[PDB]
């Protein structure tokens, strides 16, 4: 037959793991806490310009804190820093990275000030770079406070004039303080593309173009770079899709036992069902990956490494890659949409954070809570307290991590702009996780 088994020396989000998320997810152990509608506030300082040029209240989406190397929230001249994607739906597509800041001691969302856009429109054209001048949008990433005490940003260069090309990009963000309660973005330097895919380990946009682009239903990704360090080495962990040599998309992927897990009877039943049902083509195209590249000390590409984990057959889209070390173990997280999944019992309303644990950085990642489920959110997108882009922020002590997310906040009354969601706690103990009951933090709170 066509049945085979190739793990490609890497870990896999398996169908056997995923089919067990239904019912399990109904436990309060995994459910995102209900939020109080009466106290939801817009980020007051979140004001800027649209594509038309006038000043508007912004919709704030994907956000990430400035971090130390280990992932804990950094302190910069007494401030905590948050980078967030923001824009105006009258531009719809247009999104840029903004720098928000607040004295670490303060707690209120009203304390978050706005330093404005990290980049000027003109910034992408300064450096001699293979990709930057083709940029149309700024997408997610990470931020690190270097040993030299510099603000080092990683983000995604999205190119709408190159078939949705995504390039992992870096820049040093030069800061100043005009007064003793203001942070100012002076400008940027060392602004450069790092990686746009190789083809064999991670899919390139050229492979996306050559297959027929948007029409195919394929979803090309190469984004959300997350910075970490291990043993003196610098890495980025990011959302991608596999390449030709590490379990590519296509019909034959449906015959690989490694993507299914479980026993042979499960492999046969699940595969038969997948081959005959409505999700055959969707599953064939699904080859999402959490990738890892090693960097040089100047943040240029050093080595393209094999993926930490892939989601062949399950989904093309495992987003907001996150990784940190806790209790000597490596915890790897991703957010995923049920709508993009090919799993029975998981549907359009379902939104997840999935999690995995390994003894080493590049070792075998085993599912948290046996299935990989950490968080489940299933509110209608039009509900005021819909949350998205859940992100685990490690803490300096304790078994708890702080989950940040954005709340789309599409209510009828004010306040109704996309904003920081109330933060909450997830307990991490070995391979077990649990939402901490009755502990909701302030909107956008990074630490306890
Ligand atoms: Ca794909």
Automatic annotation (TrEMBL):
Q: Which sites bind substrate?
A: 61, 140, 223-224, 317-319, 337
Query: Where is Mg(2+) bound in this sequence?
Result: 196
Keyword list (alphabetical) reads:
Calcium, Glycosyltransferase, Metal-binding, Signal, Transferase
Positions with a binding annotation for Ca(2+) 1 = 218, 249, 287, 316
Entry's EC annotation: 2.4.1.10
A GO MF annotation of the entry reads: metal ion binding
So where's the catalytic machinery, residue-wise?
62, 319
Query: Entry's CDD domains?
Result: GH68
SUPFAM superfamilies associated with the record:
Arabinanase/levansucrase/invertase
Judged by the first EC level, this protein's enzyme class is transferase
- Residues the record annotates as the site (Transition state stabilizer) are 224
What are the names of the required cofactors? Ca(2+)
Which Gene3D superfamilies does the record match to this protein? Glycosyl hydrolase domain, family 43 (2.115.10.20)
**Record-annotated residues binding Ca(2+)?**
218, 249, 285, 287, 316
Q: Does the keyword Signal apply?
A: yes
| One GO term of the biological process aspect | carbohydrate utilization
Taken from the record, one Pfam family name reads Glyco_hydro_68
* Family designation: Belongs to the glycosyl hydrolase 68 family.
Q: What is this protein called?
A: Levansucrase
**Organism the protein comes from:** Priestia megaterium (strain DSM 319 / IMG 1521) (Bacillus megaterium)
Q: Quote the gene name from the UniProt entry.
A: sacB
């Amino acid at each position: 037959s066509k049945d085979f088994n190739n793990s490609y020396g890497i870990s896999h989000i398996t169908r056997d793991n995923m089919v067990k998320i239904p019912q399990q997810q109904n436990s309060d152990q995994f459910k995102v806490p209900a939020f109080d509608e009466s106290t939801i506030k817009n980020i007051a300082s979140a004001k800027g310009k649209n594509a038309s040029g006038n000043t508007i209240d912004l919709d704030v989406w994907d956000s990430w804190p400035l971090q130390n190397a280990d992932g804990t929230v950094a302190t910069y001249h007494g401030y905590q820093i948050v980078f967030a994607l923001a824009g105006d739906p009258k531009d719809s597509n247009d999104t840029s990275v903004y720098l928000f800041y607040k004295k670490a001691g303060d707690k209120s969302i009203d304390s978050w000030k706005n330093a404005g856009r990290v980049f000027k429109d003109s910034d992408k054209f300064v450096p001699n770079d293979p990709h930057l001048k083709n940029q149309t949008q700024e997408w997610s990433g990470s931020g690190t406070l270097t040993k030299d005490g510099k603000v080092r940003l990683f983000y995604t260069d999205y190119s709408g004039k190159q078939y949705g090309k995504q390039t992992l990009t870096t820049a040093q963000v030069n800061m100043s303080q005009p007064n003793d309660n203001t942070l100012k973005v002076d400008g940027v330097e060392d602004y450069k593309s790092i990686f746009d895919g190789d083809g064999k380990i991670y899919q390139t946009v050229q492979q996306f173009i050559d297959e027929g682009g948007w029409d195919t239903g394929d979803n090309h990704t190469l984004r959300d770079p997350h910075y970490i360090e291990d043993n003196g080495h610098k890495y980025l962990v990011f959302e991608a899709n596999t390449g030709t040599e590490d379990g590519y998309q296509g019909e034959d992927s449906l015959y690989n036992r490694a993507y299914y897990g479980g026993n042979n009877p499960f492999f046969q039943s699940e595969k038969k069902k997948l081959l005959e049902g409505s999700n055959k083509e969707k599953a064939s195209l699904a080859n999402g990956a959490l990738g890892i590249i090693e960097l040089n000390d100047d943040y240029t590409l050093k080595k393209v490494m094999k993926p930490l984990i892939t989601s062949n057959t399950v989904t093309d889209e495992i987003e907001r890659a996150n990784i940190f070390k806790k209790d000597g173990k490596w915890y790897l997280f991703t957010d995923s949409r049920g709508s993009k999944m090919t799993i029975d019992g998981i549907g359009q309303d379902d939104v997840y954070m999935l999690g995995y644990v390994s003894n080493t950085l590049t070792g075998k990642y085993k599912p948290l809570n046996d299935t990989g489920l950490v968080l489940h959110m299933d509110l209608d997108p039009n509900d005021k307290t819909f949350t998205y882009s859940h992100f685990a922020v490690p803490q300096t002590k304790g078994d708890n991590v702080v989950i940040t997310s954005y709340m789309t906040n599409r209510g009828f009354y004010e306040d109704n702009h996309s904003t920081f969601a109330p933060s909450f706690l997830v307990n991490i103990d070995g391979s077990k996780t649990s939402v901490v009951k009755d502990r909701v933090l302030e909107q956008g709170q990074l630490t306890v």
